[PDB]
Amino acid sequence: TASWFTALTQHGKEDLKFPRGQGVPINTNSSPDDQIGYYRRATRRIRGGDGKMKDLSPRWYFYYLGTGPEAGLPYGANKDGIIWVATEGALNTPKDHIGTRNPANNAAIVLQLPQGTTLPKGFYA
């Protein structure tokens, strides 16, 4: 039950967000109706030699609307660690036909945004 795409890594202190109309990863094999979903934050911690937990940079993964760990949330749902993106013309319907990725069958698609969209401040890949 993995994301179809590689993650965005949060080095800065600000949560991920995109202006309305931006942020949907490029997927040339999908329809314009499909271009809508959410990024979900995944946090990891590593115990250091002093016994204390240290936070690795949070990673944000994209899931199409109606798929993934938050498949039940409607577009725009207000929830910590969840942010929403949609391209103009996308349909607000669940993308059941896309679903999630089986890592044993498909490798992750390298997340690419359009040539005119840059990553939000503090985000790297």
Q: Can you count the helices (H) and strands (E) in the chain?
A: 0, 7
Residues in 53-112 at the binding interface with its own copies, rule: CB under 8 A: 54-57, 66, 71-72, 94, 96-99, 103-111
Q: Which stretch binds its own copies (CB under 8 A): 1-9, 17-25, 76-84?
A: 1-9
Say how many C-beta atoms besides its own lie within 10 A of residue 39's C-beta.
27
Site string for its own copies, 9-48 (x = CB under 8 A): x-xx---------------xxxx-xx---------x-x-x
Site string for Zn ion, 8-47 (x = CB under 5 A): -x-x------------------xx--x-------------
CA distance 93 to 99: 13
| In 16-58, beta strands by DSSP E | 36-42, 45-47, 53-55
Cβ pair 15, 83 in contact under 8 A = yes
By the 10 Å C-beta count (0-12 exposed, 13-18 middle, 19+ buried), 19 is classed as exposed
Asked if residue 40 belongs to a known ligand binding site, the reply is no
Binding site for its own copies (CB under 8 A): 2, 6, 8-9, 11-12, 28-31, 33-34, 44, 46, 48-49, 54-57, 66, 71-72, 94, 96-99, 103-111, 122, 124-125
